[PDB]
């Protein structure tokens, strides 16, 4: 069992109500499109 972890060895946004407010204003066309960013 000698190849264990081969690839492994060789490899302030706001909060709560206001954070969901940021999402509200951000969204209201994919979020993680390649185009917008």
């Amino acid at each position: 069992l000698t190849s264990a972890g081969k690839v492994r060895k060789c490899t302030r946004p706001p909060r709560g109500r206001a954070y969901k407010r940021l999402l509200y204003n951000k969204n209201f066309l994919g979020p993680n499109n390649l185009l917008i960013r």
């Binding site: 069992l1 190849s3 264990a4 972890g5 690839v7 492994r8 060895k9």
Partner: protein, 142 residues
């Protein structure tokens, strides 16, 4: 009506149900007790033991790989099982006499994926969670 009826057939409507319930594999599996006996854990979520050997397991027909596992000797009843060590690189943290904690893969003791003969996995070694041990949150001594 291919079923009995009439106001005075309650006894028969109960006899038929009682006899035919056992023809369901799940009801029989959960109510007959032979599985409660054959179960290595004796009907629990988890159990501990000492590691007796480290082994590799050759994957099933479509895939091709060597999965990592350990032969575990249960403390509570002196049985032999095999447990798959998950999560790349973790097989190094399992020495030749370790107190390990064993739980299931899911599916109530059925093989999962392509790993043949293994129905259990290790979640803690020597008092430390293997998730955090992989994720560099805790470290085994030396």
């Amino acid at each position: 009506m291919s079923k009995t009826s009439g106001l005075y057939t309650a006894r028969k409507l109960r006899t038929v149900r009682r006899v035919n319930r056992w023809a369901d594999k799940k009801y029989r599996k959960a109510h007959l007790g032979t599985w409660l006996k054959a179960n290595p854990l004796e009907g629990a979520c988890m159990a501990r033991g000492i590691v007796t050997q480290k082994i590799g397991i050759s994957a099933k027909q479509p895939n091709s790989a060597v999965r990592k596992a350990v032969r575990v000797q249960l403390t509570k009843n002196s049985k032999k099982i095999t447990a798959f060590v998950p999560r790349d690189g973790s097989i190094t943290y399992i020495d030749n006499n370790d107190e390990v904690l064993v739980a299931g893969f899911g599916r109530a003791g059925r093989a999962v994926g392509d790993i043949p003969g293994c129905r259990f996995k290790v979640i803690k070694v020597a008092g430390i969670g293997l998730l955090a041990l992989f994720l560099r949150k805790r470290e085994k001594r030396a």
